[PDB]
Structures are given as structure tokens and as C-alpha cells.
Amino acid sequence: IIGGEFTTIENQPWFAAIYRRHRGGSVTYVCGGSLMSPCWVISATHCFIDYPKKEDYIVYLGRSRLNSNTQGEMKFEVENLILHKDYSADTLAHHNDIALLKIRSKEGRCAQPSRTIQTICLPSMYNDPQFGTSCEITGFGKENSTDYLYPEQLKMTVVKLISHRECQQPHYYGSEVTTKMLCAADPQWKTDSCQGDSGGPLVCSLQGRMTLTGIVSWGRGCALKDKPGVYTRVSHFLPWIRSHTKEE
Amino acid sequence: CGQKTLRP
Numbered sequence A: 001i002i003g004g005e006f007t008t009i010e011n012q013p014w015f016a017a018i019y020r021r022h023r024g025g026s027v028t029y030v031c032g033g034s035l036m037s038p039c040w041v042i043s044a045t046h047c048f049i050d051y052p053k054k055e056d057y058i059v060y061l062g063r064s065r066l067n068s069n070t071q072g073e074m075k076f077e078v079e080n081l082i083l084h085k086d087y088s089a090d091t092l093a094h095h096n097d098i099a100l101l102k103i104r105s106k107e108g109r110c111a112q113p114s115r116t117i118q119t120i121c122l123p124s125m126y127n128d129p130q131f132g133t134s135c136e137i138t139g140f141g142k143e144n145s146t147d148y149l150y151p152e153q154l155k156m157t158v159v160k161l162i163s164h165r166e167c168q169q170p171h172y173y174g175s176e177v178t179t180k181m182l183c184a185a186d187p188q189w190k191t192d193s194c195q196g197d198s199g200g201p202l203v204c205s206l207q208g209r210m211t212l213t214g215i216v217s218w219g220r221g222c223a224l225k226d227k228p229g230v231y232t233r234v235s236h237f238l239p240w241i242r243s244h245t246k247e248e
Numbered sequence B: 001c002g003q004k005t006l007r008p
């Protein structure tokens, strides 16, 4: 992230840090997540691309520190990693970035939602805030497009939304921005998300409870004059998600 | 869901 607010597993209790292991003991941080039910996390597809193995991935719920154990945290097995059968990306954008991981306890059970371990509310049908709504994102993101270490303490920042009228313009992303993805930025060059941030929360609370409005996916450069941040609008994926969570 | 605890 490029905002400015180190926070904790109590400010974004639904966030799931996602890790990939190695034959040689270690683990490295891939992308974020969002609890939905007890055993279902939900990220972006472009993360598990080059290494599509549900077996060599470990997932953390209830953890604020990057390369260090947060007491009262739950480690999971990704017992089922199904992605989106229409994901594709071009020389700029990414379409249909959304996947679901079904997790199970090393002991044999799902999430036991508690203070830190909490779940988000899905948005209803065709329902998104207006183009002014400040929403809030987080993640162990890159603190600079050029920077290369992922900050050690979970981050957070608020950002204003943007319209089709706005983003579709010439000095922006033209026709690369579609209707199944939200554009977001601050007045100019101050805040944004970034790499490492993907697969994690655009957060706006609607009608009371804070819901999963969007999901970080792409953008040219982190925090750039006339260059928003794009999130996969969960709005349209509502049936997809529900269609897999019950049977197949 | 949307239940954000209070630790201020």
C-alpha cells in the first residue's frame, strides 16, 4: 500500500494472508484474502497462476505481522483451490480476477470465527456506492512501485471511488476499464494500493455492515497522476461464488 | 459478518 496507517488484525479481522511453501522449509507471501464462510477464503486468480497447486499453499487467519507468528492465529490447508474459468489478462488489464480457496484445519475443521477470525458481508445484487464514497483497503503491500521489501506491519488506507465517465477517459485507461471492475484513487498521487496487495479488500460499509465491495487486481504503477486502481467488482460474481460454495 | 470488534 502507499496510504499511511500501520494497523492490525482487529481493524481488518476478515483479511487472510496467503502463503506458498517450498521443498526447502520456508514460505513467501503471495496475495491477500477475505473470509466468507468458515471454510472459504476468496482472492484473485492471477496469484495462483504460475504455481496452480492447491497442495503447496498454506493460509493464515488472525495474523497482523508478516514474517512472524501472531498468537491466536489459525493455519490452514487449502483443501480445494478452484479459480475462475474465464480469467484472462492483456497487456494492461485483468478480467475475472476472483478465486475461492476452501480451507480445512490441520486437525480437521473450518474457521472458528472469533475476535480476529471474522468474516465479511457480501454485497447484494447490482449494488455499489456512488462515485465519491471513500472505502478502505489494506494489505502487506509494496510501499513503493520501486521499493522491494513488503512492509513488516499490516497496512491500511482510505480511497475515493471513480466513475465510468471518469476512468474511461483518454488520459486514463480508455476502453481497458470494463463494467465488471471498479476504479479507485485519492485526489492525486498521494495514496493507492500496489503489488502484493492483490486478492484483498476494497472496503465500504453499506447500509450498516462493512461489505466486500471490491477486490484489488491491477493498475499501471502504484499511485499515479490520472491512474486509478482497479478492483474486481464482486457485484456481478455473486452467483458464481454461491454456485460453488454449496455442492460443485 | 461486517462485525468489526472494538479495541480502542
Ligand SMILES: *C[C@@](*)(O)[C@H](CCCNC(N)=[NH2+])NC(=O)CNC(=O)[C@@H](N)CCC(=O)O
Pocket (backbone or CB within 6 Å): A031, A046, A047, A091, A092, A093, A094, A192, A193, A194, A195, A196, A197, A198, A199, A216, A217, A218, A219, A220, A221, A222, A223, A228, A229, A230
Ligand atoms: C496481482 C496483484 O498483486 C497486482 C495488484 C496491482 C495493484 N496496483 C495498483 N496500482 N493498484 N496486480 C497486477 O500486478 C496485475 N497487473 C498489473 O497491475 C499490470 N498492469 C502492471 C502495470 C505496471 O506495473 O505499470
